[PDB]
Amino acid sequence: RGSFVEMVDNLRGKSGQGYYVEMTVGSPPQTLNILVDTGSSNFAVGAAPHPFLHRYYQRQLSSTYRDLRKGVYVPYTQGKWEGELGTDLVSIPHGPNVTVRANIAAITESDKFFINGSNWEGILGLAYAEIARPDDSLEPFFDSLVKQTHVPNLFSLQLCGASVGGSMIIGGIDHSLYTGSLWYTPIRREWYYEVIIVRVEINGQDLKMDCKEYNYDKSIVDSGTTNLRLPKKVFEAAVASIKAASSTEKFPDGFWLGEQLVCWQAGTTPWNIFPVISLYLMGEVTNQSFRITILPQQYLRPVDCYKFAISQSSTGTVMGAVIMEGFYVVFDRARKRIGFAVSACHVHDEFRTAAVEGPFVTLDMEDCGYN
Ligand SMILES: N#Cc1ccc(C(=O)Nc2ccc(F)c([C@@]3(CF)N=C(N)OCC3(F)F)c2)nc1
Ligand code: NA
């Protein structure tokens, strides 16, 4: 408990391409790099020589592979894969010292799914069975891990942004990865890692929207998305504040829509003109909340050119890597809650830091949830 030196620094990645962990599948073990995704629930790996892939799962080499005799077709908004379901033995070399029999979707066809130039070749969905495809009887990897072993039912993520890196601590928390205290928000329902945002501030100024707007139709914590996505109305209000707060430089309108980059002469990005953004999350106690604060170092991504990485959503709020890179995030499944603490590795300057602060007094938090 509290100390997991073998798992520290077990994540890698490249700017814009996600954080992946090494895994082994089958017997003998085949090594694969697998993207860590708290926004989905399938363990799915390339299983055919797609040209973008460095490595892929060759089921014919595994004496422990078992076919489920069932296909799966998974369309997303942009992109899709299809695959054949089976189970095999899986382990995590820089992770707990166990092997589990897990479901694996062998991806045999895909479109706009793999990234040309990336170094991963599958995805580990860490969310709940309810959003698993094709349905919720396909048990997700972490559920299998916890049923078949004594690994406790929680994992934590420290994502260190830009070549990126971090730590996925499986079964525990490592205190050297954060400073100050962890603050917890309830998981509102076990499907995505759904949470409730109860107030939004831009440089300390409240957007003063009806808080149900903040969670329209859900808010989730998603390591498989780069941006902070905001419901359209909230995004509109939020941009108007940020634009106002930075109004000393003007940028194309296109910029704020993620449609154009902005560039400054190297080593001169004027961070100080851009405001901090705070989300207050529902706390553990009635009428109690706490607040996480991020910097422009988080929401202006380097591509010295930058992309504005807060964007409009039609799927609710998505607290992607733009939020998570500021914090150490604990997915405390056993107690249905998500903890945040300031990450010991987050990108900051000599004037401002990411922050997690409480308790605050917030009434009518239950009304913030959308039904
Ligand atoms: N920083 C960061 C960063 C940068 C990139 C990537 C990334 O490529 N993520 C990715 C790839 C393929 C996917 F297919 C997904 C899915 C699979 F479910 N997962 C979530 N969460 O949302 C989009 C999605 F399509 F639904 C994600 N991730 C994070
Ligand atoms: Na167990």
Ligand code: NA
């Ligand atoms: Na600490």
